[PDB]
């Protein structure tokens, strides 16, 4: 069963710092290649970053490329999404998606619609 | 209300694929066995045919 | 005696050598399906062919000097021989003056050329070059001068049979002369527009940093058909003669003509596979 | 017997009949070129089809087509959607196209990261490793205009704009400022940026530069077109 | 609202799944010790069909294992004579992309669909002389990827727009619908008794359908890519899966869950397409790196490999017969094993 569990966030203040947990579970975690996706109220989905399959070939969105940090770990099957220099303007519901393909580095999970490989998404306002 | 009105029909779908008797495992492997074996020597991709009975040769 | 079985021997394991091959790329040619329609294999097929018409002709003065027979027909024979001898050559060399047109054609039109090049064309240009070195060869037989050297390891038939200059230098000015002409221009501007691609391919390498064998074989051919013209254009005014020295090129400027079509399957990667994926079924 | 003879010939003169239709038609098909155009729905991709056919047949069902004719050289293009957004599992029907007509907006600097990230993921495609894409800059002239009443988001949402320089030495349109030369050359840098790490041989990227209005564009695709079989067939021969 | 509502939908998840653990007593791979081993099937290559322009993309077989159909993307539909490789009917499609050929059980009509979100059937009787198009029908907003034919009269249809529609040839309305995936529904299959069909899709599940109700019965989520085809147990109780995870899985209408997976570690390109034979002991799936592997339905080893292609096979079809199986690939090319 494809089930991705989004933990962490809150009300928290600007300028701070911020832990994210991605538990995936049912399938393999050092095969699959994931991403993070936000939506902004009024806003449609964009993307946020990228990490390869080892943790090495990893691209952030411009918007945020030094303050955002993410790792994952294929003994405990889990990622970390840490985020510090936050901005009143970085509000948004996340969603931790996951890549259909594996061994590969290209990954459509951008669109808005009914999409069954990602989180429910966590609520994260500033 | 669109997506409301979707996870309405998505739950009472998961509603309805739940409802279902389930039957134990080791009888469908049996059912298959059998089933394997009773219609064995008909299927011509185990058994190899000769030239006189194939039209492909 | 002995350098003789010696070279009868050497000229039989080169005849072995070339039907070898022969047969070996006509059935893969045969039994492969991807090379179903290609104008380059086409002419390939075309060419093995000849060579391989060449391979079971050429063992008949191998096997007839060892019953070493003499009698008036020896002249006709000599001269039958050596009319369907000195043709196969010409009509390899014009297959593959025909490859390097096709290629010239494909470079120069990438997409006007599908409805240039159609099957009943080449099929009808490779007829018209089968009837061509077949009707410049009738003044030979005519009694007007001798045809090419291939094969002339004889005493009479060596010796009384003479050549004419005249005819020497026009089946070289009217053929010879074309067929090593067309390739120079047509192997000139696939340079000119390969070198022009590779620098502008290097060019956008260079600026984002963080990322020759057709040629030699299609030259080796034209520089080991040099010492045969030579020795004609040498012999039709009498300069030089030394029949030891010029036998050794000339019986291997006919070898070489099946040298080159095997290399030319060997150079593609499709082929290679294609050849054990046939001779493993076959073998089994 | 005699039936079953007699029905035989009719079958092999039905097969006969059936291989000369087959062939007849065949060599149309390979008189015959198409292309795909792929692109968002904001983006400038109906301006290049209409152009093409107004100066030079046409079907509104799904799939819009387009003709038109050049140099006695057929071209069928293809404007592809009336789906949903996933366009993965259908992508692999477009696996014998000669080349990818991928155009983009430079009036949304936000708007643009999708079209990047589709045009990164078409380039390191299994399927399409073999068909080279060529790059379109539409919408040129608003993006002029804009660029230069202010809004400065070049350097907010793409933080490489205050390293980099001109290297291509250029000034046909510009006439005014060299800041929209800038502004349009760091976006092709940057759209080659991945582009030439995948990519070592097999296929190559060709950024265009066209406005909303423009007449020699069917004329700037088919100079491409004329690479892209040489250079196909410059590695048909072995010869690079 | 939203809580108590997801909350009801995960506990009822763990209630099936405690279920699935408690019906399991044990698998399969420890009940098959003392069966016999086929051994090393050595398949040839009888004939060979070239007549396809484009690439072939899915063909079916008749009823009478005599004629067979087949679809490429050059817009042609072409049938095959298996016996004596010759074409009797070549059919010009409107359209240039097809996904999707179904021969009707009868011989009498044949349907195409593709691209073009419409389906065309095609009268095979031709008493004029050439062939005419019948009555083409267009009513979904998807994509059509699968088609299959109930009988003379209904056909079975899979959009790319999460719904599943059953068309009447005659009027060429809808009579039902079947709205319960979230993703693009790849394809389906049908029954030999024709009461009810799984369907499977890209969301990593196949779903039980019936033709008389309308409705679902059971979902099994077990597996973890997006399935590409799905394969009925000639028995009509059970059920496999191919996609391209590497892995085939096999599924049971009354188990409700997996029975055995065929996996291997020297191999990493997905399948294409599976079907049974006519005993269902092995299972011959169409992999991604230019062959066909035939699997033991009860061994999960591999019981033999046929590479006789150089491009990915696209579709792989076996008669009711069993005597041979075409296997289209996207070469333009139908090689018949035996």
């Known amino acids: 069963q494809v089930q991705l569990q989004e933990s962490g966030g809150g009300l928290v203040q600007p300028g701070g710092s911020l832990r994210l947990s991605c538990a995936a579970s049912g399938f393999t975690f050092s095969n699959y290649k994931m991403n993070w996706v936000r939506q ?16 090495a070939s990893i691209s952030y969105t411009g918007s945020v490329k030094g303050r955002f940090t993410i790792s994952r770990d294929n003994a405990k099957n889990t990622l970390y999404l840490q985020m510090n220099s936050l901005k009143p303007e970085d509000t948004a519901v996340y969603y931790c998606a996951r890549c259909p393909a594996p061994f590969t580095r290209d990954c459509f999970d951008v669109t808005s619609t009914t999409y069954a490989y990602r989180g429910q998404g966590t609520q994260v306002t500033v | 209300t669109a997506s409301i009105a979707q996870a309405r029909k998505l739950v009472e779908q998961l509603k309805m694929e739940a409802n279902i008797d389930r039957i134990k495992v080791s009888k469908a492997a049996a059912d298959l066995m059998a089933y394997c074996e009773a219609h064995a020597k008909e299927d011509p991709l185990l058994t190899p045919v000769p030239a006189s009975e194939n039209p492909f040769r | 005696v002995d350098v003789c079985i010696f070279e009868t021997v050497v000229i039989v394991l080169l005849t072995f050598l070339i039907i070898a091959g022969n047969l070996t790329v006509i059935f893969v040619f045969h039994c492969a399906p991807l090379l179903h329609h290609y104008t380059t294999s086409y002419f390939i097929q075309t060419m093995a062919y000849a060579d391989l018409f060449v391979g079971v002709s050429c063992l008949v003065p191998t096997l007839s ?8 027909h020896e002249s006709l024979t000599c001269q039958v021989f050596g009319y369907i001898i000195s043709v196969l050559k010409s009509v390899s060399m014009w297959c593959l003056a025909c490859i390097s047109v096709d290629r010239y054609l494909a470079i120069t039109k990438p997409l006007s050329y599908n409805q240039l090049v159609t099957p009943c064309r080449l099929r009808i240009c490779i007829i018209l070059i089968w009837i061509y070195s077949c009707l410049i060869f009738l003044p030979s037989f005519f009694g007007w001068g001798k045809p090419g050297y291939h094969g002339d390891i004889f005493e009479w038939c060596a010796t009384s049979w003479l050549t004419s200059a005249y005819f020497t230098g026009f089946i070289v000015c009217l053929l010879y002369a074309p067929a090593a002409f067309v390739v120079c221009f047509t192997y000139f501007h696939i340079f000119k527009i390969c070198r022009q691609h590779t620098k502008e391919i290097n060019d956008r390498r260079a600026r984002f940093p963080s990322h020759m064998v ?16 030579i020795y004609f254009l040498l012999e039709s005014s009498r300069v030089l003669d030394n029949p030891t020295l010029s036998f050794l090129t000339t019986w291997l400027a ?5 040298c080159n079509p095997v290399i030319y399957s060997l150079s593609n990667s499709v082929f290679r596979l294609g050849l054990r994926r046939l001779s493993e079924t076959m073998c089994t | 017997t005699e039936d079953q003879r007699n029905e035989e010939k009719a079958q092999r003169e039905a097969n006969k009949k059936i291989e000369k239709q087959l062939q007849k038609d065949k060599q149309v098909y390979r008189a015959t070129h198409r292309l795909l155009l792929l692109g968002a729905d904001n983006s400038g991709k109906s301006t290049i089809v209409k152009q093409m056919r107004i100066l030079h047949s046409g079907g509104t069902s799904g799939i819009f087509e387009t003709k038109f004719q050049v140099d006695k050289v057929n071209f069928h293009m293809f404007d592809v959607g009336g789906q949903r957004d996933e366009r993965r599992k259908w992508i692999q029907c477009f696996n014998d196209v000669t080349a990818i007509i991928f155009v983009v907006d430079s009036s949304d600097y936000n708007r643009l990261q999708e079209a990047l990230n589709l045009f990164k993921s078409i380039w390191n495609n299994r399927w399409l490793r073999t068909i080279s894409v060529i790059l379109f800059l539409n919408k040129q002239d608003l993006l002029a205009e804009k660029v230069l009443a202010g809004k400065s988001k070049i350097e907010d949402y793409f933080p490489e704009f205050a390293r980099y320089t001109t290297p291509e030495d250029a000034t046909p349109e510009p006439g005014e400022d060299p800041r929209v030369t800038r502004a349009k050359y760091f976006i092709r840098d940057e759209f080659l940026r991945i582009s030439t790490a995948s990519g070592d041989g097999r296929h190559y990227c060709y950024p265009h530069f066209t406005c909303a209005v423009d007449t020699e564009n069917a004329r700037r695709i088919f100079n491409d077109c004329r690479d892209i079989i040489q250079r196909m067939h410059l590695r048909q021969y072995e010869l690079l | 609202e939203l809580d108590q509502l997801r909350q009801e939908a995960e506990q009822l998840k763990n209630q099936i799944r405690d279920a699935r653990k408690a019906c399991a007593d044990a698998t399969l791979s420890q009940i098959t010790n003392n069966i016999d081993p086929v051994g090393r099937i050595q398949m040839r290559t009888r004939r060979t069909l070239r007549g396809h322009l484009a690439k072939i993309y899915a063909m079916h077989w008749g009823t009478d294992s005599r004629l067979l159909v087949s679809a490429s993307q050059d817009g042609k539909l072409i049938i095959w004579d298996s016996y004596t490789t010759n074409k009797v009917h070549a059919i010009p499609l409107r359209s240039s992309w097809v996904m999707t050929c179904a021969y009707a059980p009868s011989g009498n009509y044949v349907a195409c669909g593709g691209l073009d979100n419409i389906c065309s059937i095609y009268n095979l009787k031709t008493r004029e002389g050439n062939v005419r198009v019948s009555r083409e029908l267009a009513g979904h907003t998807g994509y059509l990827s699968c088609c299959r034919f109930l009988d003379d009269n209904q056909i079975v249809t899979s959009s790319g727009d999460t719904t599943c529609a059953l068309w009447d040839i ?7 619908t079947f709205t319960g995936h979230t993703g693009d529904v790849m394809s389906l299959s049908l029954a030999p008794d024709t009461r009810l069909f799984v369907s499977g899709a890209c969301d990593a ?16 989520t077990g597996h973890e890519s997006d399935i590409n085809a799905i394969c009925f147990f000639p028995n009509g109780n059970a059920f496999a899966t191919g996609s391209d995870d590497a892995t085939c899985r096999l599924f049971d209408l009354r188990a409700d869950q997996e029975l055995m997976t065929y996996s291997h570690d020297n191999i990493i390109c997905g399948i294409t397409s599976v079907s049974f034979s006519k005993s269902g002991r092995l299972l011959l799936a169409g992999y991604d790196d230019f062959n066909c592997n035939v699997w033991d339905a009860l061994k999960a080893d591999r019981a033999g490999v046929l ?10 079809g ?21």
């Open chain 5, 318 to 338: 076996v008669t009711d017969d069993g005597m041979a199986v075409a296997t289209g690939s996207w070469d333009s090319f139908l090689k018949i094993w035996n």
């Open chain 5, 170 to 176: 005659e009027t060429g309305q809808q009579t039902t």
């Open chain 3, 65 to 72: 000097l060892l019953h070493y027979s003499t009698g008036v």
């Open chain 3, 254 to 258: 006919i070898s070489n003509s099946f």
């Open chain 5, 205 to 220: 599940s196949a779903k039980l359908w019936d033709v008389r109700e309308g409705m679902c019965r059971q979902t099994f």
């Open chain 5, 307 to 316: 590479a006789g292609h150089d491009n990915r096979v696209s579709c792989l």
């Open chain 1, 40 to 55: 902004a109220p009024g806003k449609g989905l964009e993307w946020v970053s990228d990490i390869s399959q080892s943790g």
């Open chain 3, 214 to 229: 057709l040629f030699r074989i299609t030259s080796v051919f034209y520089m080991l058909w040099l010492p045969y013209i």
